[PDB]
Recover the amino acids of this structure.
């Protein structure tokens, strides 16, 4: 699955406790191509995600360096 | 439930057929206070809905008339 993220915003940082677990929920809106990652009812990450219909290997050719 | 809708968008109009039925699907994103109505995977409405915390009945007082 090639993927294309777009307009990702990290609203807050999650600290991993030395003991225990942190549970993250991920919710998608396929019609709007949008996703929200939440933590205990607080927004953590938001943006758009969708499958890349036509991958082009040219996109990963290294640009000529300015220096 | 006193509600509040913000930034509502109607993307396409759904035609109720003479026979049969149309299925509409509502997906809520509590963290982002957003919703989405979809029909067969096509976005029909988008926006924000959330509970009105403290209704202020003054808001419904009739505004000073234009004439």
């Amino acid at each position: 699955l090639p993927v294309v993220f777009e307009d990702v915003v990290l609203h807050q940082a999650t600290i991993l406790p030395k003991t225990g677990t942190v549970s993250l929920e991920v919710r998608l809106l396929e019609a709007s191509r949008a996703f929200e990652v939440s933590e205990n009812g607080n927004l953590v990450v938001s943006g758009k995600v969708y499958q890349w219909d036509d991958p082009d290997p040219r996109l990963f050719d290294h640009p000529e360096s300015p220096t």
